[PDB]
Ligand binder design. Structure first.
Ligand SMILES: CC(=O)Nc1ccc(-c2c(-c3nc4ccc(N5CCN(C)CC5)cc4[nH]3)[nH]c(C)c2C(C)=O)cc1
Length: 125
């Protein structure tokens, strides 16, 4: 069964627009989004549709690039590191729920390498 997806708006949360967060949306997120391995990560895992009744019994901090994109577009984040943590959470969830050599893990590994390549250098403030 599906829990509520992670929030993408929160009026009491303090927000900030930074050059680095703009970069995370304009180039980092949008480049990863077009990768041929991006499709499993563009939306919250639907455990009912995907027939994974144990997904959310295992994964307790779900995250996906669709949620990250909406957070960025809604200026949800305070700084780039908060956004980077969401990316890292998404990748780690994939490695936790699956196992080495799974097709989904191969995809996450390729995306994670591209992700780190893109954030290795960020713009300044
Ligand atoms: C038997 C088998 O392979 N089970 C299975 C089921 C689910 C997943 C799986 C998926 C996933 N599976 C999708 C199937 C469809 C879509 N679509 C919506 C996007 N749209 C362009 C195309 C359709 C998105 C998807 N994300 N994501 C993650 C993070 C997964 C895991 C387990 O970590 C991996 C394997």
């Amino acid at each position: 069964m599906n829990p509520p997806p992670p929030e993408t708006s929160n009026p009491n949360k303090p927000k900030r627009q930074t050059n680095q967060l703009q970069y995370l949306l304009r180039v980092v997120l949008k480049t990863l989004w077009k990768h041929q391995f991006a499709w499993p990560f563009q939306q919250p895992v639907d455990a009912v549709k995907l027939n994974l009744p144990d997904y959310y019994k295992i994964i307790k901090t779900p995250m996906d690039m669709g949620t990250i994109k909406k957070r960025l577009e809604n200026n949800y984040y305070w700084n780039a590191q908060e956004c980077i943590q969401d990316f890292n959470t998404m990748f780690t969830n994939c490695y936790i729920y699956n196992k080495p050599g799974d097709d989904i893990v191969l995809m996450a590994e390729a995306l994670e390498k591209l992700f780190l390549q893109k954030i290795n250098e960020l713009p300044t403030e």
